[PDB]
Amino acid sequence: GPEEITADIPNVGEAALSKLDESGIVYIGAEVTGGDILVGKVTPKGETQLTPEEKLLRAIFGEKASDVKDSSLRVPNGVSGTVIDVQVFTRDGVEKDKRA
C-alpha cells in the first residue's frame, strides 16, 4: 500500500512529535538535532485495508503496530541546525497536503 505523511507515528513520545506540525512536517525555524523527526512517514506492512479496526483500535493494546511500520526521516547523527526551508513536490492525481 502507498505510504503517506502523517503526524501519528507508532511508539514515539509526544516530545518527538512536538516539533512536527499537524500535517507531519517540522515547523520552519525550529531548532533540531540528531535523532529528531523532521518528517513522519509510515509504511504499510503485513496487512491493511481494514479501516473499522483502525478506527476502533487506534489506541487499544494491539495498536496495529505491525500494520504500519515507522519510516520517518531523521536528522543524521552529529548534525545540528535550524530548519529554514521546506519544499513539497506532489505528482498529479494525488491530493495535496496543506503545507504545499
Binding site: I28, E31, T82
Partner: protein, 232 residues
C-alpha cells in the same frame, strides 16, 4: 627604609571622553609599577563584569536566517548590530526592553523604551533601517549581566528549558573593556628620585567607570592572593 614599602594610591582620573580615560597611580617602588600594572591589565581584559544582550524576540520573525519586509538589513544583520549594543543595568541582572518603531528612517538605540533603571550609553547607535512608510517593527530584547564571552552554543547545550520558535539567541560579550595600555614613568616626591608612577589608559564601551574597574581588579587580585598568603 628597606623593610617598609611606600603605599601607592590613586591620584588622578583623567576622563578624555565617554569611553577613553586615563588613571594615575602614585607612588610605586622600582619594578612594582610594571608588575602590578601588568596584573591589572590581565585582570581588566578577562574579569570585568558587564551587561550584554542574550536573547532577542521579533513578532514577525521566526528564525534569524529569514528576512522581514520593510527592513533594509537582514535579521542576522540586526542581531549582529544588537550584539555590539552597550547598556548599563542597575538594580538587577535581568532586563527586558521593548523597541517599537514605524516609518521610514533608521532605528537608533534611543527608540528603546527605557525603564529608568537601565541606561543607554549610545542613543545614536543604529540597529536597522525601515525603508517602507507602512512598516512597523516590534522587538523584545533580553539583557543580562556576566563575565567573559558566553557563546550561544553553550546556551543551547545547557538547554535549561525549551524555547518557543522565534526566540533568537545571540552571542554574549559581557566584557566592557576593549583596550588597556599601561605606562611607567618617573615620579618626583620628597627628593626620592627613584619612585615611579603608573598611567593606565582604558578604552571601554562606557558602561563601567574606570575607577570602579580598577577597584574591582584590585579586589579580585587581593582575593586571589589571599590563598597564597594563607599557604594552607
Amino acid at each position: 627604609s628597606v623593610t617598609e614599602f611606600l603605599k601607592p594610591r590613586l591620584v588622578d582620573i583623567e576622563q578624555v571622553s565617554s569611553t577613553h580615560a586615563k588613571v594615575t597611580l602614585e607612588p610605586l617602588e622600582r619594578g612594582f609599577g610594571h608588575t602590578l600594572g601588568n596584573a591589572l591589565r590581565r585582570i581588566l581584559l578577562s574579569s570585568m563584569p558587564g551587561c550584554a544582550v542574550t536573547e532577542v524576540e521579533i513578532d514577525g520573525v521566526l528564525h534569524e536566517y529569514s528576512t522581514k519586509e520593510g527592513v533594509q538589513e537582514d535579521i542576522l544583520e540586526i542581531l549582529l548590530n544588537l550584539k555590539g549594543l552597550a547598556v548599563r543595568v542597575q538594580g538587577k541582572d535581568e532586563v527586558i526592553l521593548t523597541l517599537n518603531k514605524s516609518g521610514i528612517g533608521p532605528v537608533t538605540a534611543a527608540d528603546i523604551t527605557h525603564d529608568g533603571d537601565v541606561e543607554i550609553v549610545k542613543p545614536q547607535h543604529v540597529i536597522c533601517h525601515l525603508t517602507d512608510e507602512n512598516a512597523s517593527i516590534s522587538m523584545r530584547i533580553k539583557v543580562q549581566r556576566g563575565r567573559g564571552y558566553v557563546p550561544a552554543s553553550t546556551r543551547i547545550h545547557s538547554e535549561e528549558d525549551e524555547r518557543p520558535i522565534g526566540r533568537l539567541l545571540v552571542d554574549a560579550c559581557y566584557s566592557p573593556v576593549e583596550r588597556i595600555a599601561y605606562n611607567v614613568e618617573a615620579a618626583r616626591v620628597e627628593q626620592r628620585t627613584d619612585l615611579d608612577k603608573l598611567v593606565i589608559e582604558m578604552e571601554t564601551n562606557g558602561t563601567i567607570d574606570p575607577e570602579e574597574a580598577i577597584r574591582r581588579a584590585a579586589t579580585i587580585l587581593a582575593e586571589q592572593l589571599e590563598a597564597f598568603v594563607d599557604l594552607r
